[PDB]
Homo-oligomer: A and B are copies of this chain.
Amino acid sequence: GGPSVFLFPPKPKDTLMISRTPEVTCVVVDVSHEDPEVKFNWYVDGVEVHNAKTKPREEQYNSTYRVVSVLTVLHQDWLNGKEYKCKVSNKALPAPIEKTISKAKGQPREPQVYTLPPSRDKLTKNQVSLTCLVKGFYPSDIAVEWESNGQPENNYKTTPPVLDSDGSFFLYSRLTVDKSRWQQGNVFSCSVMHEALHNHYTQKSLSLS
Q: CB within 8 Å of B: which residues of A?
A: 112, 114-119, 121-122, 129, 131, 133, 135, 155, 157-160, 162-165, 170-172, 174, 176
Contacts and interface: CB of A to CB of B under 8 A. Distances in A.
24 contacts: A112-B121, A112-B122, A114-B122, A114-B129, A116-B116, A116-B117, A116-B131, A119-B133, A129-B133, A129-B135, A131-B131, A131-B172, A133-B174, A135-B174, A155-B165, A157-B162, A157-B164, A158-B162, A159-B172, A160-B160, A162-B174, A165-B176, A172-B172, A172-B174
A174 to B, nearest CB: 7
Contacts of A117: 116
A157 B133 contact: no
Nearest to A120: B114
A158 B162 CA distance: 8
Contacts of A160: 159-160
Contact of A116 (B119, B157, B163, B165): B119
Given A112-B121, A157-B162, A162-B174, 10 more contacts: A114-B118, A114-B121, A114-B122, A116-B131, A157-B164, A158-B162, A159-B171, A165-B176, A170-B174, A172-B172
